[PDB]
Amino acid sequence: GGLTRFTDQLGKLWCSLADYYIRSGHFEKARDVYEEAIRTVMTVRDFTQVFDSYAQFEESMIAAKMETASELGREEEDDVDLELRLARFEQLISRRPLLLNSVLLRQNPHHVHEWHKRVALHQGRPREIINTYTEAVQTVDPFKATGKPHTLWVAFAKFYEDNGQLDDARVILEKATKVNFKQVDDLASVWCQCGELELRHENYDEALRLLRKATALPARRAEYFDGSEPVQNRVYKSLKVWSM
């Protein structure tokens, strides 16, 4: 009830609610509340308070598990219980960059820079990298994007290109062209990357074919500036595409 009433105090209330559950001997329920706190929190300031309190809780139970296993004699499940809590504390600190980045993404899903930083943390783990590109493409509104949305698409295609998955990258570029971005320059830069990819792989006829479709005129003699027209239509005038 207080958490609904006192909307600004939440992280402090969670720690006080966890404290109650610690004293109840439901140490697992304390962990339940702290992860629930981490999920609900949307400021780094509150997150720091939850992280530090949870780590101290983790530290105190790890030390307690060390002492009790030595005093009581180590049953195999009891020694494994200690190894789990340490590994949960290892998980906690390693999750902390990802959680920190996620909190900023809770504040602004449009934060393309934090998406790049998320992938930068995911580095070496290809499936996590692939998924977070897909999530970025879904979540980010181009019209609200802080950091331009095509930069996601370029990195998305480049990752598959680095994996040699060129036809998948092409499908990514095809999907990219379907997007009506905030600005024509975003889509134009994609069309450049469509060409430039084929230049690297020397598929020069395909590069020409793509740019022929890119330059291809609307049935109207459309302006470069008319925002009511599809962004794909506007690209036909673009200085970059024609010069390339």
Dig out the tokens for 96 from the structure: 């902390």
What is the nearest approach in angstroms of other proteins to the Cβ of residue 130?
29
Reference 28, options 88, 93, 103, 78; nearest CA is 88
Residue from 22, 84, 137, 222 in contact with other proteins (CB under 8 A): 22
> What x-and-dash track marks residues 33-72 binding other proteins by CB under 8 A?
-----------xxx-xx-xxx-xxx-xx-xxx-x--xx--
Is there binding between residue 73 and other proteins (CB under 8 A)?
A: no
What is the nearest approach in angstroms of other proteins to the Cβ of residue 45?
5
Dig out the tokens for 123 from the structure: 């580095």
Within residues 108-167, the interface with other proteins by CB under 8 A covers none
> In the chain, helix, strand, coil percent, each to 5?
75, 0, 25
Residue 70 or 123 having the CB closest to other proteins: 70
Reference 134, options 164, 159, 162; nearest CA is 159
Helix (H, G, I), strand (E, B) or coil at 146: strand
Helix (H, G, I), strand (E, B) or coil at 61: helix
Residue 62 or 137 having the CB closest to other proteins: 62
Residue from 3, 6, 39, 83 in contact with other proteins (CB under 8 A): 83
Residue 89 or 179 having the CB closest to other proteins: 89
Residue 204 or 224 having the CB closest to other proteins: 224
Tell me the torsion sign for CA atoms 70, 73, 78, 80: positive
Alpha-carbon torsion angle 99, 103, 109, 110, nearest 10: -100
Residue from 4, 5, 7, 23 in contact with other proteins (CB under 8 A): 23
* Candidate segments 32-40, 76-84, 106-114, 131-139, binder of other proteins by CB under 8 A: 76-84
- Please count the helices (runs of H) and the strands (runs of E) in the chain: 13, 0
Residue from 32, 75, 90, 141 in contact with other proteins (CB under 8 A): 90
> What x-and-dash track marks residues 193-232 binding other proteins by CB under 8 A?
-------------------------------xx-------
Alpha-carbon torsion angle 117, 119, 124, 130, nearest 10: 180
Phi/psi-derived region of residue 202, left when phi > 0, alpha when psi is between -120 and 50, beta in every other case: left
Which stretches of 43-140 are DSSP H helices?
Answer: 44-72, 76-107, 112-122, 126-139
What is the nearest approach in angstroms of other proteins to the Cβ of residue 127?
26
> Site residues (CB under 8 A) for other proteins?
9, 12, 15-16, 19-20, 22-25, 27, 44-46, 48-49, 51-53, 55-57, 59-60, 62-64, 66, 69-70, 74, 79, 82-83, 86, 89-90, 93, 96, 224-225, 239
